[PDB]
Every structure is written in structure tokens, then in C-alpha cells.
Amino acid sequence: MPPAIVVLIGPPGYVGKQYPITASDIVIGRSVESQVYIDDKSLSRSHAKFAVNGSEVSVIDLGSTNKTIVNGQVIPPLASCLLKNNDQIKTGNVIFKFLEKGS
């Protein structure tokens, strides 16, 4: 399977949902235009996005109100983080787990 993110912590409609990360330009946000749409008021309308190049998947912060945090480190606006298996990504009151192979 391609890589994915899983909702570890979130609202009841969303906890445990998995989203495949197959290509660049996938956006996490509360705007309905987002590919990873979560209805949580603490998530920015456009919060973060992914870049994919072969086996490398990175997350990019888009100037979010409540920040993008990977394993306890803040990713400042327009900066990025190369992900690895089991990393946690906190976006407001939502926390995702990154899986190098999705279930």
C-alpha cells in the first residue's frame, strides 16, 4: 500500500479514519476544497500540505493559527519536515500518525 496518515486524536466522526498520501499537493484543512477535510474549529481552513518524491513524503505548514508540530517540534510557516514511519503530526486539537504503508 502507499503511505497514509491515520487520525489518532480527533472528533468522533473522524477518529481512526485513514487518508492515503499518494502525490504532492494534498492539503489538510477545514475548507471543503481540502483533500484531507476535518470539521474541527481549531484546524485552519488551509492548515498544512504534502510534497511527495518517490519514497520521500514531507509536510509543509501553511501559516496555520495553531501550528503544525511533528514529534514535539514546531514547523514554522512555509518550512517543512521529512516524515518517517510512526511520526505524529499535531494540527490544532487533531493528531495524525504517519504510516510508511497504510492498512
Numbering used by the authors: 32 to 134
Give the authors' words:
B. bacteriovorus is an obligate bacterial predator of other Gram-negative bacteria, exploiting adaptations that allow consumption from inside the prey cell periplasm. The DgcB protein appends the C-terminal GGDEF enzymatic domain with an N-terminal forkhead-associated (FHA) domain, known to be used (in other proteins) for interactions with phosphopeptide ligands. DgcB comprised a ~30aa tail, 100aa FHA, 20aa linker and 160aa GGDEF domain. We provide the molecular basis for initiation of c-di-GMP production, demonstrating that the stimulus is a phosphopeptide tail present on the DgcB GGDEF synthase itself.
By combining a tailless DgcB FHA construct (residues 32–131, V32 replaced with an initiating methionine) and synthetic phosphopeptide (N7SDNLEKpTSIVASDT17) in-trans, we were able to obtain complex crystals diffracting to 1.48 Å resolution. The asymmetric unit of this new form contained two FHA domains that were in an offset dimer identical to both the full-length and FHA-only structures, providing a third independent observation of this interaction. The exposed FHA cleft of chain B displays clear density for a bound phosphopeptide, allowing unequivocal modeling of residues 11–21. The conformation of the bound tail region does not differ substantially from that of the unphosphorylated complex (rmsd 1.0 Å for all atoms), but sits relatively deeper into the FHA cleft, making more extensive contacts. The FHA surface creates two depressions which accommodate the two “inwardly projected” residues of the tail (pT14 and +3 V17); the flanking L11 and T21 sidechains sandwich opposing sides of the central FHA body. Comparison of the peptide-bound and unbound FHA domain structures reveals that peptide binding does not induce any obvious gross conformational change or long-range signaling motions, merely alterations in the rotameric states of R61, K72 and R76. Our structure of the FHA:phosphopeptide complex demonstrates that cleft occupancy does not alter the FHA:FHA contacts, at least for a peptide added in trans.
